[PDB]
Each structure stands twice: as C-alpha cells, then as structure tokens.
Amino acid sequence: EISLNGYGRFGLQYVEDRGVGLEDTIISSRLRINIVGTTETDQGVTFGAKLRMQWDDGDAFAGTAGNAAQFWTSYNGVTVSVGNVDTAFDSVALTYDSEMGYEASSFGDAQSSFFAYNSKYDASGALDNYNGIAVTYSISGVNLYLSYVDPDQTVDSSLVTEEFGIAADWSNDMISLAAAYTTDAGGIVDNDIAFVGAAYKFNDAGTVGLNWYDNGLSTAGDQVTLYGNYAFGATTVRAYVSDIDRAGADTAYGIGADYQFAEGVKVSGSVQSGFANETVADVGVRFDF
Amino acid sequence: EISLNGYGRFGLQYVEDRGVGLEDTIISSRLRINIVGTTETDQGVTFGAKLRMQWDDGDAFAGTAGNAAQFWTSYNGVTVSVGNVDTAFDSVALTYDSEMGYEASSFGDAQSSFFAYNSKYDASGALDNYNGIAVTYSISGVNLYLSYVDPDQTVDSSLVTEEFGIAADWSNDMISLAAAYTTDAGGIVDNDIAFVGAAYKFNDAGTVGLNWYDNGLSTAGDQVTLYGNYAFGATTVRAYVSDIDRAGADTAYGIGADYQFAEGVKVSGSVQSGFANETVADVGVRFDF
Amino acid sequence: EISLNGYGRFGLQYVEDRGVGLEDTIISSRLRINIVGTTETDQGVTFGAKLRMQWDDGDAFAGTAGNAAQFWTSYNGVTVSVGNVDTAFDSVALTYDSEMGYEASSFGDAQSSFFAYNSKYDASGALDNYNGIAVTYSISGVNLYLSYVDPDQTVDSSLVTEEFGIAADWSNDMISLAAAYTTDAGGIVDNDIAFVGAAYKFNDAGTVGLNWYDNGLSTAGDQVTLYGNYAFGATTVRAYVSDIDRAGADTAYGIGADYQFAEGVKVSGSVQSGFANETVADVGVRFDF
Numbered sequence: 078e079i080s081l082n083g084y085g086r087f088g089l090q091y092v093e094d095r096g097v098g099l100e101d102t103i104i105s106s107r108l109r110i111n112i113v114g115t116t117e118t119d120q121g122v123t124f125g126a127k128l129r130m131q132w133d134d135g136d137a138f139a140g141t142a143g144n145a146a147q148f149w150t151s152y153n154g155v156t157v158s159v160g161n162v163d164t165a166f167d168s169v170a171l172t173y174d175s176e177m178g179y180e181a182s183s184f185g186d187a188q189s190s191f192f193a194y195n196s197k198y199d200a201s202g203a204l205d206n207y208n209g210i211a212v213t214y215s216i217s218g219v220n221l222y223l224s225y226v227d228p229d230q231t232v233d234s235s236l237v238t239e240e241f242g243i244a245a246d247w248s249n250d251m252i253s254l255a256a257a258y259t260t261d262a263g264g265i266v267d268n269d270i271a272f273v274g275a276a277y278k279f280n281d282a283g284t285v286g287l288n289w290y291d292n293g294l295s296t297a298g299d300q301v302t303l304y305g306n307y308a309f310g311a312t313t314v315r316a317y318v319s320d321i322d323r324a325g326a327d328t329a330y331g332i333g334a335d336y337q338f339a340e341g342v343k344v345s346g347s348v349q350s351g352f353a354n355e356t357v358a359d360v361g362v363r364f365d366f
Numbered sequence: 367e368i369s370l371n372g373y374g375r376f377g378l379q380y381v382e383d384r385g386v387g388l389e390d391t392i393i394s395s396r397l398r399i400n401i402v403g404t405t406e407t408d409q410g411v412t413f414g415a416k417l418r419m420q421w422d423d424g425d426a427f428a429g430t431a432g433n434a435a436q437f438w439t440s441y442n443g444v445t446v447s448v449g450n451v452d453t454a455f456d457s458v459a460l461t462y463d464s465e466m467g468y469e470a471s472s473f474g475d476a477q478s479s480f481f482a483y484n485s486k487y488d489a490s491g492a493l494d495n496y497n498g499i500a501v502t503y504s505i506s507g508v509n510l511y512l513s514y515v516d517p518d519q520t521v522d523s524s525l526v527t528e529e530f531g532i533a534a535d536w537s538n539d540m541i542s543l544a545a546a547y548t549t550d551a552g553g554i555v556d557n558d559i560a561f562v563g564a565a566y567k568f569n570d571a572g573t574v575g576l577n578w579y580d581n582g583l584s585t586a587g588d589q590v591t592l593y594g595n596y597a598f599g600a601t602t603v604r605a606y607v608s609d610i611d612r613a614g615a616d617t618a619y620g621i622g623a624d625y626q627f628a629e630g631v632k633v634s635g636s637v638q639s640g641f642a643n644e645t646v647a648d649v650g651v652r653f654d655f
Numbered sequence: 656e657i658s659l660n661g662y663g664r665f666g667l668q669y670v671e672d673r674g675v676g677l678e679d680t681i682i683s684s685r686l687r688i689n690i691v692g693t694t695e696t697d698q699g700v701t702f703g704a705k706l707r708m709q710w711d712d713g714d715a716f717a718g719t720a721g722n723a724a725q726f727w728t729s730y731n732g733v734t735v736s737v738g739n740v741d742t743a744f745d746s747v748a749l750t751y752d753s754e755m756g757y758e759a760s761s762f763g764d765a766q767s768s769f770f771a772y773n774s775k776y777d778a779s780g781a782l783d784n785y786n787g788i789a790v791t792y793s794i795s796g797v798n799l800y801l802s803y804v805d806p807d808q809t810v811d812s813s814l815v816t817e818e819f820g821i822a823a824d825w826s827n828d829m830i831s832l833a834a835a836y837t838t839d840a841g842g843i844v845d846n847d848i849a850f851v852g853a854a855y856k857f858n859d860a861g862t863v864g865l866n867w868y869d870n871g872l873s874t875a876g877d878q879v880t881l882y883g884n885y886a887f888g889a890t891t892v893r894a895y896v897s898d899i900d901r902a903g904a905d906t907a908y909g910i911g912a913d914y915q916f917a918e919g920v921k922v923s924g925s926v927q928s929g930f931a932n933e934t935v936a937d938v939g940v941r942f943d944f
C-alpha cells in the first residue's frame with residue numbers, strides 16, 4: 078500500500094535589515110509531500126519505506142526532487158529504521174516546544190550542530206554515503222530513542238566520526254520530562270551535546286516549560302529556554318525567553334499566536350528577537366492534506 | 367487529500383530540413399503528472415497546492431523532476447494563488463484556440479514574450495526567486511484574471527522589472543469575447559502586449575474566430591489570426607491563417623483534424639506553414655488519466 | 656487512473672577485500688516506486704505510461720528523481736511500447752533464473768552489453784535522445800518479443816548504431832524453452848549476442864536449468880550456466896555454476912536461500928564466487944507494496 082500526505086504553507090517573512098540591496102520582507106512558502114509505502118503482515122510485523130519531496134522558496138533550479146530513503150520494521154512497539162533516519166536528539170519531546178509563527182521557529186531551540194532526518198538532496202555530495210540506524214521503543218508514557226549515524230559507511234570506520242545518541246521522554250497528564258545526549262554530534266569530534274527539559278500543564282489551557290542545553294562545541298555555550306503557551310478557544314498565545322553563555326549575547330525572546338481556522342488549517346504569526354539583536358516577524362497559514 | 371492526474375502523448379513530429387545531420391522526423395512524446403493537495407473546510411474556504419512532473423523527449427539527463435510549487439485559496443468564486451502562478455495573458459479564453467495537431471501548436475498563437483506557469487525546473491537559475499500573485503474571479507459568463515510576477519522577490523523592487531497583467535473573457539451560447547493586457551511582459555521593460563479576440567459559434571458544430579495581438583517589443587509586430595473549426599461527429603477539422611507586421615514575412619497557415627477515439631483519447635494531426643516558410647507536420651495521440 | 660506500486664529492500668552486502676580504505680560490508684538498500692497512468696477504453700484498447708523513481712545507497716546527491724517515460728498501447732494480447740522500452744534480450748524468460756540473494760545477483764547471468772529499461776536518469780547525457788520501440792505478443796504459452804533502440808533519434812540514422820533484438824519463450828507445466836538474439840547490442844557494432852535456455856520442473860518443488868550465451872564482443876566469450884532450485888515449504892534453496900571462455904577464468908558458483916516470511920515479504924541470502932575469484936555474500940529483506 079502506498080499513501081501520500083503533506084502540507085503547504087505560505088505567508089510573509091520579515092527580517093529587519095536583511096541585507097544591502099535585499100528586501101526585508103518576502104513571501105516564504107513550502108510544499109512538503111511524503112510518500113510512504115507499507116507492507117503489513119499477519120505475523121504482526123510491519124515494513125515501511127518513505128521518501129520526501131519538499132520545495133521551499135529560493136530553492137536552486139526552481140525544482141523539487143526526492144531525498145534519500147528511510148526504511149523501517151515495527152513489531153510490538155519497537156521500530157528499527159535504516160538509511161535517512163530520525164535521530165534521538167531531534168526526536169525527543171519538549172525540545173522544540175518554544176517554536177512559534179507559521180514557520181515554527183525559535184531562537185530558544187538548541188544552538189548546536191547534530192544530524193537529523195534530511196528532507197532534501199545535498200548538492201555538495203556530503204550525504205552520498207550517509208547511513209544511520211535508529212531504534213525506538215514506546216513503553217506506555219515512556220519513549221526511548223536510539224540512533225547511530227555513519228556519515229560515510231563505505232569508508233573504514235576508524236577514519237570517520239560516527240554520531241551516537243540516546244533520548245527518553247515521559248509524560249502523564251500534567252508533567253513531562255525529557256532528556257537527550259549525543260556524542261560526536263554532526264560527526265564533529267568532541268561535539269558532545271545534552272538536553273534536559275520539563276513542562277507543566279498548569280491547566281487544560283496552559284503549559285510552561287524549561288529546556289536546558291549543553292551546546293557542545295557551539296559558540297553559544299550552555300543555554301536555558303523558558304517558554305509557555307495558553308489556549309483561549311481556537312487561538313493560542315505563545316512566548317519564550319532564551320539565554321546563552323556567549324559573552325555579550327542578548328536575551329532572545331518571542332511572542333506569537335496560532336489560530337485554528339479549521340481542522341488541518343492553522344494561521345500563525347510571531348515577532349522574535351535574537352541573541353545578536355536580530356528582529357524577525359512572520360504571518361502565514363499552514364494547511365495539511 | 368492528494369490527487370494525481372495527467373496525460374501522455376506520442377506520435378511523429380516532422381520539420382522539413384530540420385538541420386544538417388539531423389533527422390526531419392522524430393518520435394516526440396510527453397508525460398505529464400500533476401500532484402494536487404487540497405484542504406477543504408466547513409467554512410467554505412478551500413486551500414490547495416500543486417506540483418508538476420513533466421518529461422519531454424530530448425530532456426537533459428533523460429530524467430524527470432518536479433517544478434516550483436503553486437498555492438491557492440478559493441472562496442465564493444474568487445481564487446488567490448501564490449508562487450508559480452498562472453498569468454492573465456496565458457489564462458484568458460480564445461487566445462490559443464487556433465492550435466492543432468497532437469502537440470497543440472499554431473503559428474497563429476501570439477508571437478510575444480510573457481511569463482506563464484512554469485512546467486519544469488530551470489537549470490540556469492533564472493527562476494530561483496521568481497514569485498507571482500494571481501487573482502481570478504468568475505462572475506457568471508464573465509471571468510476576470512489578474513497577475514503580478516516578480517522575477518526575483520529577494521532583490522529590492524526598484525532594481526527588478528515586475529510583470530502586471532489583466533484579462534477578461536465573456537461568453538454566452540454563441541458569442542465569446544476576450545481581451546488581455548500585460549505591461550513589462552516577461553520582465554522586459556516596455557514590452558507591453560495586448561490581445562483582443564472574438565469567436566462566433568455559427569452552429570452547434572462550427573466556430574470561427576479572430577484574434578488580434580500587439581506583440582510589444584517582438585520583431586513580429588502586430589498580428590491577426592483568423593481560425594475556425596467544424597465537428598463532423600467524432601472528427602473535428604481545424605484551420606487558421608495568421609499575418610504579422612514583420613517586413614517580408616509569409617502568411618502562416620495550418621490545417622489539421624482531431625478524432626475523438628474514446629473519452630480521454632484523442633488522435634490528432636496537422637500540416638502547418640510558418641512566417642519564415644517553415645513546414646511542420648505531426649500525427650499522434652493524447653490519452654488522459 | 657494513476658496507480659503506484661514498488662518495493663523496498665535492505666540488508667548486508669559483503670565483498671571480500673572491496674578496496675583499500677574501504678569497508679568490505681555495507682548496508683545496501685533500494686527504494687523503487689513505479690507511477691503508472693492508464694486509460695482504458697470500451698473499444699478494448701488500453702493506453703498507458705510509466706515513470707520510475709528509484710534510489711539506491713550511494714546515489715549521487717543523496718536524492719531521487721524520475722527516469723525517462725515509457726508509453727504503450729495494448730489490444731488483443733499485442734502491446735506496442737515507445738520511449739524507455741523493455742528490450743527482448745532483457746525480457747525473455749529463463750535468462751535471469753540463476754539469480755539469488757536479496758539483491759538478485761548471479762555471475763551466471765549473461766556477461767554481455769545490451770540495452771534494457773533504464774531505471775534512472777543518466778548524468779552523462781548519453782540517454783538524452785535515446786528512444787526505443789518494442790512489440791510483444793502473447794500467443795498462449797508462447798511469448799514473442801521484439802525491440803529496436805535508437806541511441807540518438809535526432810541524428811541521421813546512418814551515423815548511429817541501432818540495436819535490434821528478437822526473443823521467444825514457450826512453456827507448459829514442466830518444460831520451458833527460451834531463445835534470444837540481438838544485433839549491435841548496446842549500440843556496439845558487431846556486438847551480436849545470443850541466448851538459448853531450457854528448464855525442467857522435475858517436480859512441483861524443484862527445477863533445473865541450463866542457459867547458454869554468445870556474449871558477442873565481451874571478453875567473457877561463450878558462457879554456460881547450470882542452475883537449480885528446490886522449495887521446502889516456505890524456504891527455497893538455490894545454486895548455480897557458470898563457465899566462460901575467457902582464458903584463465905575460474906568457474907563461478909553460488910548458493911543461497913529464500914524465505915517467504917509473508918505475502919510480499921521475502922528474506923534472502925547468498926554466498927557467491929566469481930570468474931576472477933571474487934567472494935561476495937549478502938543477507939536482506941525485500942518487501943513489496
């Protein structure tokens with residue numbers, strides 16, 4: 078069986094003083110299509126493969142291609158994936174919950190380098206022999222993630238730096254905890270990164286959270302992001318403040334709102350301020366199909 | 367929801383004295399697949415996105431890729447589209463009705479340069495930051511089209527030439543009228559083009575029409591195309607004559623026929639003669655799926 | 656109507672002493688998706704077109720694109736195809752039946768050069784104007800195949816070498832016979848190749864066969880492959896020995912097994928030895944969807 082799903086999004090993206098001769102505001106858009114092939118068996122083992130075709134405004138050649146494949150096998154809550162896998166640091170819960178706006182961005186997200194599912198081809202040839210193995214296990218409330226990525230599997234191992242990551246999250250109705258650790262993240266020796274986050278659903282409508290990161294070899298240093306959101310019916314308000322160790326850096330912050338127009342149609346906007354005082358704003362829609 | 371539709375066509379394409387060392391007759395074919403994602407809402411607003419994958423004989427690398435995305439929002443007969451949009455000059459009725467043969471060609475089509483939906487990627491990088499906005503409105507019988515195309519939206523506007531076009535067509539059971547105007551067509555300063563056409567369904571089986579064009583900065587100058595067609599059951603006969611202002615140019619003309627083999631299967635052929643006395647002929651099939 | 660089908664496969668691929676600085680064992684995988692558009696008519700003539708998107712580990716740019724189109728028309732058991740066609744030498748029965756392992760490989764396959772359906776684009780530009788015509792006819796038990804491939808249809812014919820091939824196979828419940836002949840195979844002048852094969856289903860569970868090849872201008876010279884397989888329920892055991900004329904060459908051989916895990920899920924493995932004493936082994940799964 079083969080199924081297609083995806084989303085489209087478009088709106089205005091503003092970055093103050095974007096560049097000399099450049100327009101500060103542009104119409105940023107993305108079309109994403111996922112192609113998923115699945116083979117179910119009566120033994121209870123499911124096999125699957127997926128390909129992604131994603132286009133973003135500004136893409137080279139004004140064209141769209143597929144990325145590298147991901148394959149998996151699931152059985153009893155355990156899933157083993159091979160190829161262009163999802164990594165533990167990128168998969169844990171809470172880590173991206175400060176994001177806002179129609180482009181789901183946040184200066185409060187981790188400021189480190191690490192491997193993650195690649196949505197597109199890479200013209201540089203860097204990903205040509207990139208191959209990962211991932212294992213996930215959902216043990217009611219608790220989720221375990223494990224990933225190993227070999228940036229070039231054809232070359233003798235001792236010559237390449239592989240990334241290994243572990244992550245776990247747990248949640249009940251009002252408290253959520255998450256942690257992750259990755260060594261040689263992004264295939265960079267000694268770029269060991271860590272994450273610890275907690276959230277409290279202090280209501281049926283609101284949640285506040287705190288994420289802490291060890292950004293490894295990043296110039297940002299350690300980071301702390303405090304975020305929260307509150308739902309007033311169909312509209313959700315979001316905000317966050319983030320601080321990094323980098324000497325002289327500013328406190329990043331953002332405020333935004335989401336509006337659930339209909340099932341699968343979300344209108345969002347935000348105004349944010351970065352660590353180097355960058356001012357960014359956006360307003361657009363995302364529709365799922 | 368995601369739906370796929372498209373067509374395939376193949377046949378013989380002949381151009382007399384095509385070139386030294388070249389074959390005059392080749393097997394020309396095209397495969398077109400449209401991928402459309404739609405999100406309907408109970409509020410009556412529909413959202414959609416589309417991608418096209420088209421291959422034509424002779425395409426570089428013997429491969430097929432997708433083009434740049436188009437997004438739209440429809441509500442009450444009004445549709446607003448963004449990205450790789452359909453333009454007013456290319457969308458009005460009547461303007462392409464002289465076309466014949468399985469490749470739907472005609473020297474009687476406008477001999478000017480203007481932007482239109484891009485079916486494929488562009489290796490030159492010219493379309494990388496190309497973005498348009500289009501608005502259409504169907505007011506029973508009357509159709510309004512509006513388009514604005516910015517060839518490079520990231521660059522300061524005063525530095526780039528944007529194309530703006532307006533078009534309208536109206537029709538009852540036997541008369542049709544259409545007009546269009548585009549300034550800086552194709553992003554070429556002062557390349558202002560215009561179209562005025564009328565058709566008369568002098569029967570249930572036949573129609574004759576007259577299209578007039580102001581080809582802007584084209585060497586063709588003004589143009590007049592007289593065309594007509596008549597249906598004898600499943601077979602339709604077509605013909606046209608076209609004249610351009612260019613000094614020394616010949617009168618272009620063509621004769622062809624269509625045969626509706628079955629629903630979605632059309633066999634067509636034509637023999638045409640161009641403004642520079644080019645002789646072209648074709649015979650093939652188009653099947654829709 | 657448009658339908659998608661395909662398969663995914665992954666496993667371990669081992670080649671002893673693969674290269675200096677290289678890993679002998681890698682995780683080799685492939686994702687194949689076929690897009691087929693069909694137009695059925697009440698006259699009993701079916702039209703179709705197909706595109707393939709295939710990705711294999713190691714592919715350049717870590718991306719996936721479509722290949723060149725194939726079109727066809729079927730009526731009363733006769734099918735005429737145009738474009739990226741399947742060729743007679745590659746389509747006859749028996750010729751690939753010695754293949755084993757999850758990657759369906761065999762040193763016993765013909766060691767010659769010939770054209771065949773192209774699953775992917777070609778960055779070299781060699782396939783840009785490649786066009787073939789194929790005709791097949793199924794006359795109960797007997798299958799006829801005919802193919803003509805013009806490597807560059809735009810260039811004067813006398814300047815290019817076209818490939819022409821004929822093939823036929825016949826089978827009843829226990830005996831199968833197949834033969835094929837192709838002149839200027841692969842567009843190489845005088846590279847005339849031939850195949851003759853026979854198989855005997857000496858049981859409901861086992862079959863033994865013998866394939867003989869004239870490899871044309873290949874250094875292999877004539878070749879003989881003796882193969883057989885036997886099914887013990889869900890597991891099938893396979894083996895083959897192959898000999899080529901090339902002076903000093905070793906006898907190639909392989910042993911492998913298939914395990915039908917469920918409908919559409921096959922686990923396979925093999926250990927093989929080549930003509931130059933290459934030792935290869937593999938173990939993986941193929942799942943169809």
Ligand SMILES: CCCCCCCCOCCOCCOCCOCCO
Pocket residue numbers: 087088089100102103104344360361362446448499
């Ligand atoms: C300097 C900006 C130049 C481009 C024109 C700006 C006005 C564009 O909006 C109109 C068309 O729709 C496309 C953009 O999406 C904007 C609105 O937000 C999405 C729906 O709320």
Ligand SMILES: CCCCCCCCOCCOCCOCCOCCO
Pocket residue numbers: 135136137142143198200715716718719720
């Ligand atoms: C195999 C799937 C098709 C993907 C291949 C596209 C390869 C294009 O690059 C070829 C070399 O030229 C370099 C292009 O510049 C960078 C393009 O990518 C960047 C923006 O998305």
Ligand SMILES: CCCCCCCCOCCOCCOCCOCCO
Pocket residue numbers: 089090091102312313314332333334335336346347348358359360
């Ligand atoms: C010329 C700039 C155009 C692009 C950016 C527009 C940016 C402004 O929108 C910001 C929205 O976020 C504001 C806060 O939301 C709080 C709650 O009230 C809204 C309830 O739906």
Ligand SMILES: CCCCCCCCOCCOCCOCCOCCO
Pocket residue numbers: 376377378389391392393633649650651735737788
């Ligand atoms: C100089 C031409 C060289 C190629 C061979 C010419 C004969 C080809 O037609 C046979 C195969 O079908 C493919 C082409 O479509 C032609 C017929 O028109 C379509 C159906 O009416």
Ligand SMILES: CCCCCCCCOCCOCCOCCOCCO
Pocket residue numbers: 137138140141142424425426431432487489
């Ligand atoms: C990103 C989607 C894949 C589209 C990218 C293909 C890019 C190929 O070009 C890379 C640079 O090389 C130049 C090729 O020559 C022109 C090819 O296009 C012309 C015929 O259709």
Ligand SMILES: CCCCCCCCOCCOCCOCCOCCO
Pocket residue numbers: 378379380391601602603621622623624625635636637647648649
């Ligand atoms: C060697 C050249 C091969 C490719 C071109 C073939 C061109 C000839 O076909 C032209 C058909 O148009 C003729 C006029 O149609 C008029 C009506 O009668 C047909 C009714 O179905």
Ligand SMILES: CCCCCCCCOCCOCCOCCOCCO
Pocket residue numbers: 157159210665666667678680681682922938939940
């Ligand atoms: C030197 C090899 C380096 C990579 C790790 C080897 C172990 C890999 O197998 C585990 C993950 O699944 C992916 C590979 O498929 C192998 C098993 O065969 C398929 C199912 O029987």
Ligand SMILES: CCCCCCCCOCCOCCOCCOCCO
Pocket residue numbers: 426427429430431713714715720721776778
């Ligand atoms: C038009 C469909 C997209 C296919 C075009 C990809 C063209 C990429 O090549 C552009 C020129 O650069 C040469 C690349 O090196 C070889 C890539 O292919 C080999 C491995 O599969």
Ligand SMILES: CCCCCCCCOCCOCCOCCOCCO
Pocket residue numbers: 667668669680890891892910911912913914924925926936937938
């Ligand atoms: C380190 C090498 C890893 C990759 C290669 C593994 C190769 C070994 O597997 C070979 C299997 O073929 C053996 C013969 O099968 C005979 C029948 O018994 C099996 C019944 O299901």
